[PDB]
Coordinates of C-alpha atoms in Angstrom, one line a residue:
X1 CA -81.4 -50.8 -61.9
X2 CA -82.5 -54.3 -61.7
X3 CA -81.2 -57.6 -61.1
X4 CA -81.6 -58.7 -65.0
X5 CA -78.8 -55.9 -65.2
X6 CA -77.2 -58.2 -63.5
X7 CA -73.3 -59.1 -65.0
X8 CA -70.4 -61.3 -64.6
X9 CA -66.7 -60.5 -66.6
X10 CA -64.1 -62.7 -66.1
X11 CA -60.3 -60.6 -65.7
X12 CA -58.4 -63.8 -65.5
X13 CA -59.1 -67.6 -64.9
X14 CA -59.6 -67.3 -61.6
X15 CA -60.1 -63.6 -61.4
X16 CA -63.9 -62.6 -62.0
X17 CA -65.7 -58.7 -61.4
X18 CA -69.4 -58.7 -60.8
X19 CA -72.3 -56.4 -60.8
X20 CA -75.1 -57.6 -59.0
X21 CA -78.4 -56.1 -58.3
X22 CA -79.6 -58.8 -55.9
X23 CA -77.7 -61.2 -53.2
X24 CA -75.0 -62.5 -54.1
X25 CA -75.3 -66.4 -54.9
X26 CA -72.6 -68.6 -53.0
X27 CA -70.8 -71.8 -54.3
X28 CA -68.2 -74.1 -53.3
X29 CA -65.9 -73.1 -54.7
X30 CA -66.2 -69.7 -55.5
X31 CA -65.5 -66.6 -53.1
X32 CA -67.3 -63.5 -53.1
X33 CA -66.0 -60.2 -51.5
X34 CA -67.0 -56.6 -52.3
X35 CA -65.2 -53.5 -51.4
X36 CA -68.4 -51.1 -51.3
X37 CA -68.0 -50.3 -47.5
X38 CA -64.4 -51.0 -47.0
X39 CA -62.4 -48.3 -49.7
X40 CA -66.0 -45.5 -49.8
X41 CA -64.8 -42.1 -51.5
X42 CA -65.1 -39.2 -49.1
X43 CA -66.9 -36.7 -51.5
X44 CA -66.7 -33.0 -50.9
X45 CA -69.8 -32.0 -52.9
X46 CA -71.3 -34.2 -56.4
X47 CA -67.7 -35.7 -56.6
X48 CA -68.1 -39.3 -56.2
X49 CA -64.4 -40.8 -57.0
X50 CA -62.3 -41.5 -58.4
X51 CA -60.5 -43.6 -55.5
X52 CA -57.4 -42.3 -54.0
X53 CA -54.2 -43.4 -54.5
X54 CA -54.0 -45.4 -51.4
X55 CA -57.3 -47.2 -51.7
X56 CA -55.4 -48.1 -55.2
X57 CA -52.9 -49.7 -53.1
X58 CA -54.8 -51.3 -50.5
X59 CA -57.2 -53.0 -53.2
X60 CA -54.0 -54.5 -55.4
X61 CA -52.7 -55.8 -52.1
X62 CA -56.3 -57.6 -51.0
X63 CA -56.5 -59.1 -54.7
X64 CA -52.5 -60.5 -54.7
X65 CA -53.2 -61.9 -50.6
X66 CA -56.4 -63.3 -51.7
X67 CA -54.9 -65.2 -55.0
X68 CA -52.0 -66.1 -53.0
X69 CA -54.1 -67.9 -50.1
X70 CA -53.7 -71.5 -49.9
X71 CA -56.9 -71.8 -48.1
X72 CA -58.9 -70.6 -52.1
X73 CA -56.2 -71.5 -54.5
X74 CA -58.7 -73.8 -56.2
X75 CA -61.5 -71.5 -55.5
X76 CA -62.2 -68.3 -58.3
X77 CA -62.4 -65.0 -56.6
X78 CA -65.3 -62.5 -57.3
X79 CA -64.9 -59.2 -56.8
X80 CA -68.5 -58.0 -56.7
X81 CA -70.3 -54.6 -56.8
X82 CA -73.8 -53.3 -55.6
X83 CA -76.5 -51.2 -58.0
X84 CA -75.2 -48.1 -56.9
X85 CA -74.0 -46.7 -60.0
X86 CA -71.2 -44.5 -58.1
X87 CA -69.9 -47.6 -56.3
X88 CA -69.8 -49.3 -59.4
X89 CA -67.6 -46.9 -61.5
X90 CA -65.6 -46.5 -58.3
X91 CA -65.2 -50.8 -58.3
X92 CA -64.5 -51.3 -62.0
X93 CA -61.9 -48.7 -61.5
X94 CA -60.1 -50.5 -59.1
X95 CA -60.4 -54.0 -61.4
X96 CA -58.9 -51.8 -64.1
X97 CA -56.1 -50.6 -62.3
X98 CA -55.2 -53.6 -61.3
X99 CA -55.2 -54.8 -64.8
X100 CA -53.0 -52.3 -66.3
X101 CA -50.8 -52.1 -63.0
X102 CA -50.1 -55.7 -62.2
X103 CA -51.6 -57.3 -65.4
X104 CA -49.4 -56.2 -68.3
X105 CA -52.7 -54.9 -69.8
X106 CA -53.1 -51.8 -72.0
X107 CA -55.6 -49.2 -70.7
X108 CA -57.8 -49.8 -74.3
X109 CA -57.9 -54.1 -73.4
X110 CA -58.9 -53.1 -69.6
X111 CA -61.7 -51.0 -70.9
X112 CA -62.8 -53.2 -73.5
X113 CA -62.6 -56.0 -70.7
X114 CA -65.1 -53.9 -68.2
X115 CA -67.5 -52.9 -70.9
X116 CA -67.8 -56.2 -72.6
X117 CA -71.1 -57.3 -70.6
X118 CA -71.9 -53.8 -71.9
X119 CA -72.2 -52.3 -68.6
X120 CA -72.6 -48.3 -68.5
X121 CA -70.7 -46.8 -66.3
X122 CA -71.0 -42.6 -65.2
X123 CA -68.3 -40.6 -65.7
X124 CA -66.4 -39.5 -63.0
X125 CA -67.5 -35.8 -62.1
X126 CA -65.7 -32.7 -60.3
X127 CA -66.0 -31.1 -56.8
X128 CA -67.4 -27.8 -57.9
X129 CA -71.0 -27.0 -56.6
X130 CA -74.3 -27.1 -59.3
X131 CA -73.5 -29.0 -63.1
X132 CA -70.7 -30.3 -63.8
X133 CA -68.7 -29.1 -67.0
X134 CA -66.3 -31.5 -67.9
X135 CA -66.0 -35.8 -66.8
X136 CA -63.5 -37.9 -66.5
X137 CA -63.8 -41.2 -67.7
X138 CA -62.4 -44.5 -66.7
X139 CA -60.3 -45.2 -69.6
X140 CA -59.0 -41.4 -69.2
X141 CA -57.9 -43.0 -65.4
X142 CA -56.8 -46.1 -66.5
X143 CA -53.9 -44.0 -69.4
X144 CA -53.4 -41.8 -66.3
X145 CA -52.7 -44.8 -63.8
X146 CA -50.5 -46.4 -67.0
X147 CA -48.4 -43.5 -67.9
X148 CA -47.6 -42.9 -64.3
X149 CA -46.2 -46.1 -64.3
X150 CA -43.7 -45.1 -67.1
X151 CA -43.2 -42.0 -65.6
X152 CA -42.2 -43.2 -62.3
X153 CA -45.0 -41.6 -60.7
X154 CA -46.6 -44.6 -58.9
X155 CA -44.4 -47.2 -58.1
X156 CA -46.3 -49.2 -55.5
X157 CA -42.4 -51.0 -54.4
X158 CA -41.9 -48.2 -52.8
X159 CA -45.2 -46.7 -51.9
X160 CA -45.6 -46.0 -48.6
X161 CA -49.5 -46.5 -47.4
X162 CA -49.0 -45.9 -43.9
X163 CA -47.1 -42.3 -44.9
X164 CA -49.7 -41.2 -47.5
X165 CA -52.6 -41.6 -45.2
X166 CA -50.8 -40.2 -42.2
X167 CA -50.7 -36.9 -43.8
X168 CA -53.5 -36.6 -45.9
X169 CA -55.4 -35.9 -42.4
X170 CA -55.8 -32.3 -41.6
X171 CA -54.7 -32.9 -38.7
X172 CA -51.8 -34.0 -39.8
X173 CA -51.3 -31.3 -42.4
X174 CA -53.9 -32.6 -45.2
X175 CA -51.0 -33.2 -47.9
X176 CA -50.4 -35.1 -50.9
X177 CA -47.2 -36.0 -53.2
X178 CA -48.3 -35.2 -56.6
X179 CA -45.0 -36.3 -58.8
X180 CA -42.6 -38.2 -56.2
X181 CA -39.7 -36.3 -55.1
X182 CA -40.7 -33.5 -57.3
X183 CA -44.5 -32.0 -56.1
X184 CA -46.9 -31.5 -53.0
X185 CA -50.1 -30.0 -52.5
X186 CA -51.3 -29.0 -49.0
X187 CA -53.7 -27.0 -47.6
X188 CA -52.8 -23.1 -46.9
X189 CA -50.6 -22.5 -43.4
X190 CA -52.3 -19.9 -41.2
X191 CA -49.7 -17.7 -39.0
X192 CA -50.4 -18.9 -35.8
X193 CA -51.7 -22.5 -35.5
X194 CA -54.9 -23.7 -34.3
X195 CA -54.8 -27.2 -34.0
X196 CA -56.7 -27.1 -30.5
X197 CA -59.6 -27.6 -31.3
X198 CA -62.6 -26.9 -33.4
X199 CA -60.5 -26.9 -36.7
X200 CA -57.3 -28.4 -37.5
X201 CA -55.2 -25.5 -38.6
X202 CA -51.7 -25.6 -39.2
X203 CA -49.1 -23.0 -39.1
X204 CA -46.2 -23.0 -41.3
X205 CA -43.7 -25.0 -38.7
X206 CA -45.9 -28.2 -38.6
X207 CA -44.2 -28.6 -42.7
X208 CA -40.7 -27.4 -42.5
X209 CA -39.5 -30.5 -41.1
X210 CA -41.2 -32.8 -43.4
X211 CA -40.2 -30.3 -46.2
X212 CA -35.9 -30.2 -45.1
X213 CA -36.0 -34.5 -45.5
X214 CA -37.9 -34.6 -48.0
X215 CA -35.3 -32.1 -50.4
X216 CA -38.5 -29.4 -50.6
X217 CA -36.8 -26.1 -51.9
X218 CA -39.7 -23.9 -53.0
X219 CA -42.7 -22.9 -51.8
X220 CA -45.8 -20.9 -54.3
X221 CA -49.1 -19.4 -52.7
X222 CA -51.8 -18.9 -54.8
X223 CA -53.8 -18.4 -52.0
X224 CA -54.2 -15.1 -50.4
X225 CA -51.6 -13.8 -47.3
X226 CA -52.4 -15.9 -44.0
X227 CA -48.8 -15.9 -43.3
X228 CA -45.8 -14.0 -43.8
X229 CA -43.5 -15.4 -46.0
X230 CA -40.6 -15.0 -43.6
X231 CA -41.3 -18.0 -41.7
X232 CA -40.5 -20.3 -44.5
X233 CA -37.7 -17.7 -46.4
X234 CA -36.3 -18.0 -42.7
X235 CA -36.1 -21.3 -42.8
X236 CA -34.2 -21.5 -46.2
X237 CA -37.4 -21.8 -48.6
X238 CA -37.5 -19.7 -51.5
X239 CA -41.2 -18.6 -51.3
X240 CA -43.5 -17.0 -54.3
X241 CA -46.3 -15.1 -54.2
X242 CA -48.5 -16.3 -58.1
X243 CA -51.7 -15.6 -56.3
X244 CA -55.1 -15.3 -58.3
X245 CA -58.3 -15.5 -57.8
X246 CA -60.3 -18.1 -55.6
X247 CA -62.1 -20.2 -58.0
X248 CA -61.0 -19.1 -60.8
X249 CA -58.6 -19.5 -63.6
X250 CA -54.5 -18.3 -64.1
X251 CA -53.6 -15.5 -66.5
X252 CA -51.0 -17.1 -68.9
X253 CA -48.7 -14.7 -67.4
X254 CA -49.3 -16.3 -63.8
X255 CA -48.4 -19.5 -66.0
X256 CA -45.4 -18.7 -67.8
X257 CA -44.2 -17.4 -64.3
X258 CA -45.6 -21.0 -62.5
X259 CA -43.8 -22.7 -65.0
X260 CA -40.5 -20.9 -64.9
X261 CA -40.2 -21.6 -61.1
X262 CA -40.9 -25.1 -61.2
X263 CA -38.4 -25.7 -64.4
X264 CA -35.7 -24.0 -61.8
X265 CA -36.5 -25.3 -58.5
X266 CA -33.5 -27.0 -57.5
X267 CA -35.9 -30.3 -55.6
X268 CA -39.3 -30.5 -54.9
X269 CA -41.7 -27.9 -54.9
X270 CA -44.5 -27.5 -52.6
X271 CA -48.2 -25.8 -53.9
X272 CA -50.9 -24.3 -51.6
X273 CA -54.1 -22.3 -52.4
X274 CA -56.2 -22.9 -49.1
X275 CA -56.9 -25.7 -49.4
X276 CA -54.8 -27.3 -52.0
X277 CA -57.7 -28.6 -54.4
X278 CA -58.7 -25.8 -57.0
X279 CA -55.7 -23.6 -57.5
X280 CA -53.5 -25.7 -56.5
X281 CA -53.9 -28.7 -58.8
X282 CA -54.9 -26.5 -61.8
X283 CA -51.0 -24.9 -62.0
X284 CA -49.5 -28.5 -60.7
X285 CA -51.6 -30.1 -63.8
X286 CA -49.9 -27.6 -66.3
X287 CA -46.2 -28.3 -65.5
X288 CA -47.4 -32.3 -66.0
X289 CA -49.3 -31.4 -69.7
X290 CA -46.3 -29.8 -70.6
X291 CA -43.2 -32.0 -69.8
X292 CA -45.3 -35.2 -69.4
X293 CA -47.2 -34.2 -72.9
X294 CA -50.1 -36.4 -70.5
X295 CA -53.8 -34.9 -71.3
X296 CA -56.0 -32.6 -69.7
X297 CA -58.7 -35.5 -68.6
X298 CA -54.8 -37.7 -68.2
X299 CA -53.4 -35.1 -65.7
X300 CA -56.7 -35.0 -63.6
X301 CA -57.5 -38.1 -63.2
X302 CA -53.7 -38.7 -62.5
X303 CA -53.9 -35.6 -59.7
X304 CA -57.4 -36.5 -58.0
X305 CA -56.6 -39.7 -57.3
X306 CA -53.4 -38.3 -55.4
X307 CA -55.3 -35.7 -54.1
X308 CA -58.9 -36.1 -54.1
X309 CA -61.3 -33.0 -55.1
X310 CA -58.4 -31.1 -57.7
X311 CA -59.3 -29.3 -60.2
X312 CA -62.8 -27.4 -60.1
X313 CA -65.4 -26.0 -61.8
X314 CA -63.9 -23.2 -64.9
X315 CA -60.1 -24.8 -63.8
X316 CA -61.1 -27.7 -66.2
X317 CA -62.4 -25.8 -69.0
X318 CA -59.1 -24.2 -68.7
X319 CA -56.7 -27.1 -68.7
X320 CA -58.7 -28.6 -71.6
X321 CA -58.5 -25.3 -73.3
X322 CA -54.5 -24.9 -72.9
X323 CA -53.5 -28.9 -73.2
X324 CA -52.6 -27.6 -77.4
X325 CA -50.8 -25.1 -75.9
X326 CA -48.7 -26.4 -73.3
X327 CA -48.2 -29.7 -75.5
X328 CA -46.2 -27.7 -77.8
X329 CA -44.6 -25.5 -75.6
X330 CA -43.1 -28.3 -73.9
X331 CA -42.3 -29.9 -77.1
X332 CA -40.0 -26.7 -77.4
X333 CA -38.6 -26.8 -74.3
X334 CA -37.2 -30.7 -73.8
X335 CA -35.5 -29.8 -77.9
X336 CA -34.0 -26.7 -77.1
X337 CA -32.2 -28.9 -74.5
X338 CA -31.2 -31.6 -76.9

């Protein structure tokens, strides 16, 4: 909490990361830039990050842009962050992502570097109200990012920033792809829109075109009923109602039923609850732990990076608890198919 705790950490022979508790001191051959007020997290409640897939992308682009410029080829680049622990975690989060994605570093090597100066980062909290029951560390986010690369979940070669930023907005539907070509999480539609100010409520229609052009063939409602299934089924979409108590955990019957559907859907699946954060992210997470054998913490990190605020309160304990089981089921699954 004092400029005594300032620290500089080398990432590459030209890229440096600093946690300055005071005024950055200049130099003719050193370029300083901060993202604390450029790539800010939009918090629901007490959550404070990690930053979403887009901001990650924007950051990785700002770096490559700065290293490529001929106006500073002979300068060292220092990404500095401030005295806000929350801002420090996210900033460190971005350098970490850059090392994994663009550099060829491992999640552990990247974590090792970031904590070399001995900095103590506060782990990422959830969006529930009051006391958190589970936290995801930077290392957890690095493993999540790594695997996403190995599994085509993340591909900054094809990633479309304008498209991602367009649909996450409430006025455009507030939707995010979790697994490209396979899963979408969005806000539950209301029977009859109301985009006419006050709120940005959407009817099932505003999603139909997007869903078809992106091969969505299934839809799952975990929320209560705000519209008639007909409006989706009449457009050729297979619909399902796996509803379960808001802010609660899903029974094993629901999970086995959710996994079944997904496993047999013939294309992308769009999932939604009221906000498409809690219940929605929880079941999609289950699918991932089962088929990609990722950990509850690795999976929860990937999801929140895609759609910030997902998985809440008890839902976190649920996944963590179920991990071993889904892993084992996915083991038998893959083998029966072999």
